[PDB]
Design a protein around this ligand. Sequence first.
Ligand code: CLA
Ligand code: CLA
Ligand code: CLA
Ligand code: CLA
Ligand code: CLA
Ligand SMILES: CCCCCCCCCCCCCCCCCC(=O)OC[C@H](CO)OC(=O)CCCCCCCCCCCCCCCCC
Ligand SMILES: CC1=C(/C=C/C(C)=C/C=C/C(C)=C/C=C/C=C(C)/C=C/C=C(C)/C=C/C2=C(C)CCCC2(C)C)C(C)(C)CCC1
Ligand SMILES: CC1=C(/C=C/C(C)=C\C=C\C(C)=C\C=C\C=C(C)\C=C\C=C(C)\C=C\C2=C(C)CCCC2(C)C)C(C)(C)CCC1
Ligand SMILES: CC1=C(/C=C/C(C)=C\C=C\C(C)=C\C=C\C=C(C)\C=C\C=C(C)\C=C\C2=C(C)CCCC2(C)C)C(C)(C)CCC1
Ligand code: OEX
Ligand SMILES: [Cl-]
Ligand SMILES: [Cl-]
Ligand SMILES: [Fe+2]
Ligand code: NA
Lengths: 37, 449, 61, 35, 238, 336, 44, 50, 30, 32, 49, 32
Amino acid sequence: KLPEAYAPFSPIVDVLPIIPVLFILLAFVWQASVSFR
Amino acid sequence: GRDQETTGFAWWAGNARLINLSGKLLGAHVAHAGLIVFWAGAMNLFEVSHFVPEKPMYEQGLILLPHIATLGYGVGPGGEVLDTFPYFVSGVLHLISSAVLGFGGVYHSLIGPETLEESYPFFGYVWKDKNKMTNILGYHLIILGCGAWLLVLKALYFGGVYDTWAPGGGDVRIISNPTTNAAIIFGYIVKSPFGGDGWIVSVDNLEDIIGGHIWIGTLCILGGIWHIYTTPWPWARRAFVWSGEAYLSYSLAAVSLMGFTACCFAWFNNTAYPSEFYGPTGPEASQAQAFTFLVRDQRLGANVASAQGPTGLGKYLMRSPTGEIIFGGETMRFWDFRGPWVEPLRGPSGLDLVKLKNDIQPWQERRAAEYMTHAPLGSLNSVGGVATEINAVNFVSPRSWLATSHFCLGFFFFVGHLWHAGRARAAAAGFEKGIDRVDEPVLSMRPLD
Amino acid sequence: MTSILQIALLGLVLVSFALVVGVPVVFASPNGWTENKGVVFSGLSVWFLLVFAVGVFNSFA
Amino acid sequence: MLTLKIFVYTVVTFFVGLFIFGFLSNDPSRNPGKG
Amino acid sequence: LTYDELQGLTYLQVKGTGIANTCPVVEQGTSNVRELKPGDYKLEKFCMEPTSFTVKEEDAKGREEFVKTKLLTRLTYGLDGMNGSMKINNDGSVEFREDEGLDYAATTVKLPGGEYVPFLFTIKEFDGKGTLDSFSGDFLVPSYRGSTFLDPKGRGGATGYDNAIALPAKADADEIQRLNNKSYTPGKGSAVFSVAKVDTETGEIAGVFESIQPSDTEMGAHPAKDIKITGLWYGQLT
Amino acid sequence: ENTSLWARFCEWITSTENRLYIGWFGVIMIPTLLTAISVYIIAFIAAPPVDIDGIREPVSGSLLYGNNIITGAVVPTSNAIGLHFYPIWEAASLDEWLYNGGPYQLVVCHFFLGVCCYMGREWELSYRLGMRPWIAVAYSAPVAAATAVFIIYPIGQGSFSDGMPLGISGTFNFMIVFQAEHNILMHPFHMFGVAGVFGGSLFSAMHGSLVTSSLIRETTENESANAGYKFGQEEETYNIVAAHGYFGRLIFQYASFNNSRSLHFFLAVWPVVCIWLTALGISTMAFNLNGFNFNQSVVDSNGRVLNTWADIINRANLGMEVMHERNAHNFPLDLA
Amino acid sequence: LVDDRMNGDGTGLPFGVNDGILGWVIAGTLGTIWAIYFVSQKDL
Amino acid sequence: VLGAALLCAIHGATVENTLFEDGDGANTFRAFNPTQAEETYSMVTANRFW
Amino acid sequence: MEALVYTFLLIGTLGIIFFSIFFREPPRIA
Amino acid sequence: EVNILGLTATALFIIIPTSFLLILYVKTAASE
Amino acid sequence: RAAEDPEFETFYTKNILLNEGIRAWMAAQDQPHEKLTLPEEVLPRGNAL
Amino acid sequence: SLTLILQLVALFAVVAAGPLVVVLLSVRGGNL
Ligand code: CLA
Ligand code: CLA
Ligand code: CLA
Ligand code: CLA
Ligand code: CLA
Ligand SMILES: CCCCCCCCCCCCCCCCCC(=O)OC[C@H](CO)OC(=O)CCCCCCCCCCCCCCCCC
Ligand SMILES: CC1=C(/C=C/C(C)=C/C=C/C(C)=C/C=C/C=C(C)/C=C/C=C(C)/C=C/C2=C(C)CCCC2(C)C)C(C)(C)CCC1
Ligand SMILES: CC1=C(/C=C/C(C)=C\C=C\C(C)=C\C=C\C=C(C)\C=C\C=C(C)\C=C\C2=C(C)CCCC2(C)C)C(C)(C)CCC1
Ligand SMILES: CC1=C(/C=C/C(C)=C\C=C\C(C)=C\C=C\C=C(C)\C=C\C=C(C)\C=C\C2=C(C)CCCC2(C)C)C(C)(C)CCC1
Ligand code: OEX
Ligand SMILES: [Cl-]
Ligand SMILES: [Cl-]
Ligand SMILES: [Fe+2]
Ligand code: NA
């Protein structure tokens, strides 16, 4: 568990792993927004 | 970025559009360093968050807290977790490093210099400047030697890292007199990869591991100075293809090789991958089956030395393919096992039946959590053990999982190596985009029959 | 002491969030990196200051 | 009985040596293309 | 390799070298043999490894002969870790009797021509009566397999089908040898020993032996053959 | 270059004028594969019965020992071996080497090296002929499958005895015990592989039909329709626009495969990536990650075990595991 | 023992070498191919 | 079915690796023209290769 | 008689494969 | 012993289609 | 030949016996109309499994 | 619980930040 001073931030911690997968998906949004140039 | 019609490459090949743009290469690479460090910090934060301290730390689905705990950072005598602050501070430092790395990466991708050699000759390179490629290899190899010597500093001067082979069930031990001798280190690197010895998964002791780290750090540092202060030879420049695509192929083949190696490391080692922190390997939990059953039926009253199984070999003991006595289950394929609870039960010639009868220890006896649950079964969807086991426990062995992820992704990297090997060779020849349609090598040489 | 560290960490989360949503837009903005230099320096200096503040506040919390 | 081992080890090192020096021996220039 | 120097080697040094299969010998002892002090002994660690494996076969012309063979079994043939006693007097008569230990070994050997002959190298329940120069007796010989062993049709003894599952129209008085009997009656064998290289200070005797034991009867379908085993044995007296 | 023995040897090895191009990958492909073929043929004919399971209870698997070809197989090594490297020189006799299971190790090791050097030989000919090199990349899927069932699974389960025997009935036995202890049939990679082999057959029939229908008349119901012109002209035959037009009219004419290069890349990539995935599924269960374990998954309000198709498959799988190694288990759980 | 075996299985033998003549002939074969290649290098 | 998957993969790969030059951009898919009447692949090269 | 039948068909098919590989009709039209 | 029915079946299934294919081959090569 | 010789076996013989195992352990609930209340001691096993 | 509510609001904030960046770069000029 987290220590006492950081316990309320654990739900904010609990969403991070999907962000790298969202990075390639953001690259897909980029490539679609430039209309696949 | 730029478009297809000028770069020549489609969107699904767009990362090759920056082959000749060293600044954009730097931006993408620093951004990737940010991505890797970001995943490391995030996952260390999760594995801190999802911790149950009273249980052994391998059933919680945590892969890299064993990486910190193998360094002994907050590890009890028997293997107790004690504290989680080193894991927390490691994760947060990784996250801050990830933020600064990602900012640098996006900066060099967007507003960083588009081409590097016009302002920074130290940082710019065409992909035939073989001397400066060797300089870059020298820099990176010096870095790797520094990292190996950092592990040296931890093992000998900072009082860390857990030895599983200390008496009583292991201990975090500051390593004194590591074995750095060339005979043992090179014999460790040039032996067979099979169950007789095991090529690189054979390091039974951390003096041997740290002496190997002495050797790799010294070799990388000296080879870094060499690569900095030398020029490629004619034989190397003729045998090799020198382009950024061939360099990808070499890197891909190498990284696939060490990926396959890391998979086997996770699957078999119980020394550099402590079973108390990772879960049991393949040969154990089955050695634990045989050990628990032998002690249990010798406790009830049935003898085991004169006990004979259904097939004539022995239900609880037999002789190995070599003249030593080994455990009598179906674990007779795993007679080459070495785990921290068998050497006090290991005799020179045989298994020392009188030692088994009397000199049994209760730590060895209580080492049954590896036996009962936690075997390296575990299914794709958790559930229990074997494919027929029912929804009773939620467990999978991280050894299995970061073995299969690594070996699968290493195989895909072997495929990528094959792809860029062929494309690099064909492009350096001159036919990466096809045959020239008017003068083919086919029409120039003789028919087969 | 715990409340001070928690407020500092919350502010650090918001500052890093602002940096994340702002740095790529400002960088890829046409003629934006040369004009938002002061605010980017301010955001980075504040970000580093809150990081070092949480670091020195761990030992008292 | 080790004689079989010596013979097969010799022929294996022979074939491997052919492979190693064959690809050391200016292999990328064995191409009809302009390279 | 005397037992004293074997204990001083690590488990890795012996691993893969086969010296664990080798029984300990005596070099500092004497060959007086009759010099050994009479009384009662409670000895331990019967070590027993073979040196040859020759199998008796019957020609259809009427004479008795043996022939050498080739082993399909790897290094699983020695006996290690028993305990027992003999009651020795001044003249030399003994009362040798093993009790319990690794008193069996699964072994498979072929005669010239290619016929599988598996056998269980057992010495169990051996009574030893006679002088030190030559004392013999009889030892219990188990079948080979447990009664829970299964043939590839799934039939068997204590467990199984004991019926023709593969073909349902064959249960007459012809498969009695294959289905009905399924005998596991344990046989008996004779082993003659000899004590050589006696030790006076710590009581170590390491002689040779010749043991007649029947082969495996498999499932009782075909009669067993006789296998004589020549080798060397070892024991420490306490 | 011509009075030099090694230069002559190199220009003969790398010569594309030979009937079979060999190259430097071929000088290491030919001996390993020929050795494996020779010992495989000799073992399949006259292999003495070999104990696969380490329980001194052997299987025959050879024609001269009383079975036909489909029930006969080159059988894996003994369970006493494991991954322990048992070649002929590790045996005091050829006879004991044969009983222990050495020819399987020899054929599998040599077949692995020969297949990888066939990969290299194929790339080498692609290079010397001036082509594009991705034939070996497409060939990587059967290579991955062969390594998965001959090397990766023995490594993962700790014993070559668990590897796939070289046979047909042996293939079925390994396949069924694989079902029993890993539940491959309920795995997403194996479903991708089945989808890929069915789709590979589908796309093979589809492409073949669409381009054998798209025939401008140069081969009539006679041997050819040469009456327009005989052999020896560059006037090309066949059609490829009409095939895409027919495929477009077939369902919805929006996922266009008009480019022949795109169409052939799709036909190349679909079965190759799917066989990659199913070979990796075999690789995952080598490290014993299994498939979906959907038993005990559906319950009612009172918590009763409510039977399911997954429970049907589960009882079938455990009925498979009960005959798996009738006498080679002394202990309840199956881990080794 | 009942038969003469190599008894080198395992024991950490580098390259599987148990007697020096095998290592010497490995080095001899590689050196022979190397000498042939070196003297016949540069094509001519 | 296994031979059909074999044929599909081998035929697609062979066509894709015999696609000629047909342009200056390295994206070979755009190097194809549905208007042109020439073969998109060198079947001579493919036949001698296999 | 059983075993030589299997041996003959196997080696015969391998012979037809060998003959088709090395002694085929030389290829025409591409 | 010896399955003469299977031996005959296998023998004719070899020889008759083999002779058929060979006779059309040699008659095709006789008159190209 | 497997009936007259308990020593001969093949992967085919293993597969046949394994098919009997599949039938016996699966048809009990797979065919509800057959009322297959077959006890566990008539259902066949190996050793230890 | 409050943990789930914070988890969801943090999830939405971190998933919507990226498309916000690309839309802001699309409407505030270009060079993306
Ligand atoms: C490992 C992931 C990764 C990385 C690091 C890169 C990096 C890069 N790519 Mg690339 N790409 C990727 C994946 C990746 N790519 C994938 C998966 C595809 C297939 C769809 C592509 C296809 C592709 C093409 C076709 C092109 C590039 C190009 C580029 C380069 C310039 C991009 C640019 O300037 O436009 C700007 C990008 C954006 C405006 C969108 C990204 C949004 C921001 C910048 C990042 C997200 C915000 C983040 C939180 C910022 C961090 C802030 C920090 C303070 C924490 C660059 C160095 C170009 C190139 O080759 O250079 C000539 C090019 O044309 N890529
Ligand atoms: C990953 C880091 C790295 C990389 C990428 C390179 C890359 C390179 N090095 Mg180098 N080197 C390194 C680290 C590295 N080195 C270190 C750490 C040292 C210090 C020991 C050296 C010392 C060194 C020297 C002295 C030389 C090179 C040379 C070269 C170049 C020629 C490669 C070659 O010799 O062909 C391939 C080599 C072989 C086929 C024969 C190698 C002998 C065997 C394989 C090693 C024995 C170990 C064992 C038996 C292998 C089995 C285990 C294995 C399967 C894992 C090449 C570009 C040459 C050079 O500088 O060019 C000018 C040169 O002579 N390096
Ligand atoms: C070396 C990589 C690696 C390894 C060994 C692990 C291992 C583990 N992870 Mg983890 N993970 C990883 C990477 C890895 N992860 C990455 C990169 C992410 C970011 C998305 C995550 C995010 C993550 C979360 C959120 C969680 C885990 C969890 C776990 C543990 C249990 C797995 C589970 O619960 O469900 C298993 C998940 C799956 C079986 C999904 C499989 C997805 C497949 C591999 C995708 C590819 C399939 C196919 C090829 C796609 C083709 C189409 C393509 C073109 C798109 C386990 C020990 C859990 C845990 O215990 O917390 C720590 C959990 O909560 N992981
Ligand atoms: C989705 C992609 C993905 C993911 C999520 C992972 C994830 C992981 N990989 Mg992995 N990998 C991948 C792709 C991926 N990999 C690919 C494509 C390959 C090529 C096939 C590999 C090859 C690979 C190898 C070879 C290894 C891993 C390993 C690991 C694990 C540890 C990572 C690590 O520490 O690296 C290493 C980080 C560095 C090298 C840089 C940091 C340098 C060190 C840490 C500094 C030392 C600091 C010291 C110890 C502590 C400070 C003390 C103070 C006194 C200074 C981890 C769970 C390791 C493993 O198997 O677990 C043991 C490992 O050996 N991977
Ligand atoms: C660190 C290794 C590495 C690096 C630096 C590169 C770099 C490059 N590759 Mg390459 N490649 C690699 C590994 C690598 N590759 C591997 C391992 C494979 C085998 C799978 C390939 C196969 C490959 C092909 C076929 C091609 C390239 C191409 C390219 C170039 C353009 C990339 C691009 O913009 O495509 C765009 C990027 C994308 C479309 C993103 C792909 C998304 C993937 C498919 C989804 C899977 C992700 C998922 C989460 C992981 C699942 C887990 C796994 C176990 C399945 C570029 C220079 C192209 C080229 O030849 O240019 C010259 C090209 O044709 N690569
Ligand atoms: C039990 C211990 C086992 C572990 C120890 C193993 C030690 C292995 C160390 C070998 C390292 C050699 C790297 C050369 C790489 C090829 C470079 C090349 O393309 O080389 C070619 C290059 C082109 O100019 O030239 C050159 O750089 C010349 C470099 C080659 C050097 C020649 C090798 C030494 C020759 C010794 C002859 C052996 C003779 C036979 C002895 C028989 C005894 C009866
Ligand atoms: C740390 C550690 C250690 C140590 C280790 C080491 C020391 C390692 C090493 C190693 C080494 C020392 C290595 C090396 C190597 C090499 C290689 C790997 C190579 C290569 C290459 C190739 C493959 C080639 C190819 C080719 C040819 C054939 C020729 C020409 C060119 C070309 C490219 C074509 C130990 C275990 C003790 C302990 C634990 C850990
Ligand atoms: C260019 C490009 C790209 C890429 C990008 C990138 C890669 C980015 C990044 C970046 C990064 C790499 C980032 C990272 C980061 C980090 C951060 C931002 C952080 C932080 C901080 C904080 C604030 C924290 C806090 C805390 C703590 C301290 C602990 C406890 C809990 C908490 C969480 C509260 C793409 C592909 C898209 C497209 C193409 C182009
Ligand atoms: C928040 C927090 C904390 C605190 C912290 C602090 C107060 C501090 C820090 C820290 C840090 C501070 C970290 C870091 C990072 C770093 C890095 C990441 C670096 C870098 C560098 C580089 C990367 C370089 C590059 C280059 C250049 C540019 C030049 C030339 C070339 C080269 C490449 C060398 C702790 C964790 C305690 C706990 C929890 C909370
Ligand atoms: O060897 Mn082939 O299969 Ca692998 O699990 Mn245990 O061991 Mn046996 O049973 Mn199940
Ligand atoms: Cl067992
Ligand atoms: Cl089976
Ligand atoms: Fe076509
Ligand atoms: Na059983």
